[PDB]
């Protein structure tokens, strides 16, 4: 079901078994005692000739000449904290040190791998020197180029790269330092595939990964099988593990001929590799080894901080950015003017290249963005089912295909709400990130890049958490401030509102106020008191029909108020009692709304007594 | 008691007997005689020896000698109300050819000047060309100043004065035109003291006056008192007729010697004069008076046709302000625009030097203008009880001396309401008059009583119009105060309409800000200052139990929320203090105190010490908290 170790083609290498390769590289001896016992049971073949021992396969350590289970025996013990650990140990008739390298698979014994020991070491900074340039690094650029041309010095390797991984998993050949006389890979990226997962795991374990020499013949661990009723020992954890011939294919297809990997990992998780490379084989020592592994884990730590800086910048500006609207506009009334950078770029936090405000039907943009139309259909897609809060996709095309034409300048969006409305957000967007079955003999760099390029097909750079974590602040900044900017303006419009009204109510003359279809809205007393006050109560234009005159002069007038929106300018009579009272003068008009539908009218009259002169 | 004719002093010649003189100027010769018979029951003591005769009084009028009888007969018949009429003849022993005129007296009987013609009678190329200029004439300026070079030029005497008389009646050398030699009168001004009521009637009745010589001695009338009414002689209407020595006294005092006084009356009322001056005795034929009484009355009628034609500006400004203030503004904001400058002066329908513009409590001025205090306190004064249509002062000390010191830019004001709200008027202001002129009519070197007809002149009187006039700015006309009621009126009428307009406007401007508020999912008040809950979305009152006792204030809203009335303490610090708050709380209902919800109250503020109201905007689970 799942490959044995050396043993898949590309259908399937993913699975491999690669931890449970029964074998090693023939730079160490691989020993692996029982529990109690302490008594080799199962052992790599060139243990003898390599230890220059005799019998090894099934003696206790405590023969083997030598000096191990004693300089090993203190770390198996309630004391220590386990293990993996490192000792130095002497081995043979006449005596020879090695580096031990002892930790415990879940099952199996103690695996304990040697390796023959190096000269000293001294330098005798360059640790102390190097280690601040990695805490002074400016930016990750700045780091990355520094820590390959760092690596370069401190371990002779012909070429240095350091990859980085995005949330997909693909590779990217981040930095690059390399001898002359070699192609360059600087800029090339790779399928997340390129690198299976259980490697990955594997480089997140053991953060070292050595490969001597690319055409070892690997030297088979003998009685394969645990004794210990196991089965295929898990080499999850062994220093001298051979490589799969998938990868060492390619290697080979490079030219590449030895490799040395220290992983690079960021708040638990993978963030890619500093991978060095020789085209002549090469080993480094364990002691050289120590100081890679701190490098790596200094490099992190300012990859750590330089995160962290970067929410710092974003903070400010939402920061920034809720000051600017309370005051830059809202005193100067309306807060938009504040969304736009002219120098406070809403762009940089997603790092996006356009950016687009739908707010009251309206839009406005800054950057590259499509065309208001799209940003209608798109604005479409986020409204016609619910969810919410900070929404994205880095392949708008291919997650709804009948929008891709809209690739090349918007492959990817995320779009915040601003209200509860709909058809109300932020949104901003990025290009097509495309701006920048086979066999195992066909792999190699440029196959890797084409092929990339098939993967990542209508797709946008990824939209990074910490993006994400941006565009839901701001969305949620802007909305809050933007709610409590409209409850307040409708207090103000109340008080303009009454008040306003009040100076309609405090005339001497006769107003009525009424709405797009005639029904009235105000009528102060002037109007009311004239009605020869006595019931009925008037609902509409038309109900003030029969207090003038009867006349359906009235209606018909107010008809072509209502219907036609066209106002007058005449008399009305008024009914009640000896010579049909006194006449007024009316004079109505309409107030628009828009330019075929209006707001309402207003009919003022009056002037008691026919007169405007008149004629 | 009104002083007999030549006996009046300066303190009660405002009512000398002018009317009834006793006299005659030499000139002529003056003969009344009885209807229907014809006796000359009167006449001019020189009627005799004037007319070449040996007897007049007692004689009937066919015995006289010289066809006078015959040449007024035509005139007589009570059919054709001629009179007064002007007749020709001859009469006495070498026969002169006299020109007579007649007319009919309500009291003694019938009145015959004669006076001795003397001319050719000349063609005239003198009317017609004149007539012409003055249909022709632009302004009251033009017309004025050409019938001043247009008299000056038919009769010859030294000095034409057109005087306008403004409402007070006084007077103004409104246009000059004279002599080389002579002191300029033109920009003079004078009491209305100056020509009185029975005189200003007397011009305005019989059109013409003359005074040929001011030495001139007196002829009485024989028997002086009228026969038929024992009474005197209504010589209201007598060419001859003699004059004051007020006057006279006044003449000699200026160095003219006669005078030709033809009369401006434009609507039945004395408008101005037309005085002709001059230094030495002057004649002038009857024909030459004919000229001048048809040249007077085609100004009367050109001064109606101007008046009449400013009207109809003064409409038209009117008509263009209703619009320059709708487009105006209401269409690019508010419509004060139009009154403001816009090259279209609101001060020129009322010949004022300022305007003030009092609304909705600011002002604003254009134009000559006192103070903004000083503005607030006659809107303050116009504002003690109820005024009426336009109002007007123009002694604003002396009518409310309490803004005595107000009289120099505004010794004069006319305002309208502009609302039905009080402090919302439109106004127009006028300096004290004296401020105009600015020619040395007045430097400082009293003066005052008079006295002594000797005294009489130009310079006095001049000063005297000072003395006089005060606190005072030129009247406000009926034109004026028309103007004003009509501007009021409109900028009243559209500010109403507007004003009904942005109610329409600012209700649905609120209704749609509301319905937002409403449209959150968010629980949110907003109250009014002391409290009161004004909204409450749906996403806050379903968040509230059952039964639900509706609810007022705020205060009684903290039933829920865990008790902790300490939101109570809340409301009120933010209330009573003004301070918002931003802290937690926690919900009740089903079933013990589970739904927590973070609060943001703020305060909307009203004046800058006093507040509008709050929005109690919550509110939300613990789903933003908070960091990132
Ligand atoms: C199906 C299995 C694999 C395919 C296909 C493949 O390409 N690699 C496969 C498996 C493993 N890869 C391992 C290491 C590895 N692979 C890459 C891929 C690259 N592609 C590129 O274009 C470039 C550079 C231009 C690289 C490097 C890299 C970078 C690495 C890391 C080691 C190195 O950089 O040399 C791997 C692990 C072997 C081990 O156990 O050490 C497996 C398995
Ligand atoms: C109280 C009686 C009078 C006082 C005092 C007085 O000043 N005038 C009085 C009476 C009459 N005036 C008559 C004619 C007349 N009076 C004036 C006033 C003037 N005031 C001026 O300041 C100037 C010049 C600067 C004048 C002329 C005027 C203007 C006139 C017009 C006639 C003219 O200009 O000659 C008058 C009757 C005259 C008559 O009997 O025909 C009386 C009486």
Same mark, same amino acid.
């Given at each position: ?18 931890? =449970? #390769? ?6 160490? *001896? ?8 302490? +008594?080799?049971?199962? *052992?790599?073949?060139? *243990? ?6 005799? !019998? ?34 002497? /081995? ?37 020197? #190097? ?35 995005? %949330? ?52 088979? =661990? ?91 910048? &974003? ?86 295909? %009948? ?10 969006? @995320?779009?915040?709400?601003?209200? $509860?409305? +709909? ?10 990130? @495309? ?8 792999? &190699?760099?440029?196959? !890797? ?15 990074? *958490? ?11 900044? @802007?909305? $809050? ?31 009525? /106020? ?72 009316? +004079?109505?008009?309409? @107030? ?24």
């Amino acid at each position: 079901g799942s490959p044995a170790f050396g043993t898949a083609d590309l259908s399937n290498c993913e699975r491999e078994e690669i931890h =449970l #390769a029964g074998s090693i590289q023939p730079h160490g *001896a691989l020993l692996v005692v029982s529990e109690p016992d302490h +008594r080799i049971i199962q *052992a790599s073949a060139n *243990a003898a000739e390599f230890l220059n021992l005799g !019998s090894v396969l099934g003696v206790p350590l405590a023969e083997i000449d030598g000096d191990l289970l004693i300089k090993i025996l203190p770390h198996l013990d309630p004391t220590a904290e386990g293990m993996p650990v490192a000792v130095r140990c002497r /081995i043979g008739n006449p005596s020879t040190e090695y580096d031990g390298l002892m930790h415990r698979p879940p099952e199996g014994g103690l695996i304990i791998e040697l390796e023959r020991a190096g000269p000293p070491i001294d330098l005798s900074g360059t640790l102390a020197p #190097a280690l601040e340039r990695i805490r002074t690094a400016g930016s990750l650029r700045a780091l990355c180029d520094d820590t390959a041309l760092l690596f370069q010095q401190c371990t002779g390797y012909d070429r240095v790269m350091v990859y980085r991984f995005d %949330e997909q998993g693909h590779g990217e050949v981040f930095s690059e330092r390399h001898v002359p006389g070699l192609e360059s890979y600087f800029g090339n990226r790779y399928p997340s595939s390129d690198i299976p997962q259980m490697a990955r795991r594997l480089y997140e374990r053991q953060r070292v990964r050595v490969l001597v020499d690319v055409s070892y013949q690997p030297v088979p =661990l003998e009685p394969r099988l645990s004794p210990l009723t196991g089965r295929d020992l898990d080499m999850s954890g062994c220093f001298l593990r051979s490589m799969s011939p998938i990868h060492l294919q390619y290697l080979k297809n490079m030219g590449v001929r030895a490799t040395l990997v220290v992983s690079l990992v960021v708040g638990g998780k993978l963030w890619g590799l500093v991978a060095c490379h020789h085209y002549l084989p090469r080993f480094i020592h364990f002691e050289l080894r120590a100081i890679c592994e701190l490098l790596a884990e200094a490099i992190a730590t300012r990859i750590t901080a330089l995160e962290s800086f970067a929410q710092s910048q &974003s903070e400010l500006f939402v920061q920034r950015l809720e000051q600017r609207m309370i005051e830059a506009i809202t005193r100067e009334g309306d807060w938009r003017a504040a969304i736009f950078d002219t120098s406070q770029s809403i762009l940089q936090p997603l790092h996006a290249d356009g950016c687009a405000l739908v707010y009251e039907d309206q839009i406005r943009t800054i950057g590259d963005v499509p065309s208001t139309q799209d940003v209608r259909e798109i604005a479409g897609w986020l409204d016609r089912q619910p969810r919410a809060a900070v929404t994205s996709t880095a392949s708008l095309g291919l997650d709804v295909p %009948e929008l891709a034409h809209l690739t090349r300048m918007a492959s990817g969006v @995320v779009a915040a709400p601003i209200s $509860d409305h +709909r058809g109300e957000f932020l949104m901003w967007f990025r290009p097509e990130r @495309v701006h920048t079955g086979d066999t195992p003999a066909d792999l &190699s760099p440029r196959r !890797s890049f084409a092929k990339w390029h098939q993967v990542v097909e209508g797709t946008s750079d990824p939209w990074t *958490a910490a993006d994400l974590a941006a565009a839901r602040t701001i969305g949620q900044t @802007v909305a $809050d401030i933007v709610l409590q900017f409209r409850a307040v303006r409708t207090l103000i419009a109340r008080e303009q509102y009454e008040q306003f009204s009040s100076q309609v109510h405090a005339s001497m003359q006769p107003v009525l /106020i009424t709405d797009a279809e005639g029904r009235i809205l105000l009528m102060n007393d002037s109007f009311r008191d004239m009605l020869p006050a006595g019931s009925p109560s008037a609902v509409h234009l038309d109900d003030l029909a029969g207090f003038f005159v009867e006349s359906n002069d009235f209606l018909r007038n107010v008809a072509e108020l209502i219907d036609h929106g066209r106002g007058w300018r005449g008399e009305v009579l008024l009914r009640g009692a000896g010579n049909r009272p006194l006449p007024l003068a009316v +004079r109505a008009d309409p @107030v628009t709304r828009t330019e075929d539908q209006s707001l309402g009218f207003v009919l003022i009259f009056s002037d008691a007594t026919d007169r405007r002169t008149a004629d």
